[PDB]
Design a protein around this ligand. Structure first.
Ligand SMILES: [Cu+]
Length: 128
């Protein structure tokens, strides 16, 4: 409903949006991730990861170093506000997070941390 969004990551390393708006009055927000295409998780897995704009570079750097078996996220990374699991084609995953983790006026970025994906698969998340 109002406090959720569906996003897709395809075989061409594209998310189907580059901007998410979250109603600032939502208590929680949910992202429903899916993966059109046929490529398996070990070739073209995608996740959806949320951080401040400022933290994205470090999250990406350490995440893509962490390997497939760690969903390309540094374990226990405090900079990651929320994240789905890593999914392959035909799979689905949702994450819910607390909209109080988030500041009106702050610059948020969502992105996909697997090797080669982050520059091609990112966008803004903003409260309205
Ligand atoms: Cu991706």
């Amino acid at each position: 409903a109002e406090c959720s969004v569906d996003i897709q990551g395809n075989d061409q390393m594209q998310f189907n949006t580059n901007a998410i708006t979250v109603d600032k009055s939502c208590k929680q927000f949910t992202v429903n991730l899916s993966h059109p295409g046929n490529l398996p998780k070990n070739v073209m897995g995608h996740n959806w990861v949320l951080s401040t704009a400022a933290d994205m570079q470090g999250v990406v750097t350490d995440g893509m170093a962490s390997g497939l078996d760690k969903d390309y996220l540094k374990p226990d990374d405090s900079r990651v506000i929320a994240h789905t699991k890593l999914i392959g084609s035909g799979e689905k995953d949702s994450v819910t997070f607390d909209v109080s983790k988030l500041k009106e006026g702050e610059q948020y970025m969502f992105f996909c941390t697997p090797p080669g994906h982050s520059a091609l698969m990112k966008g803004t998340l903003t409260l309205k």
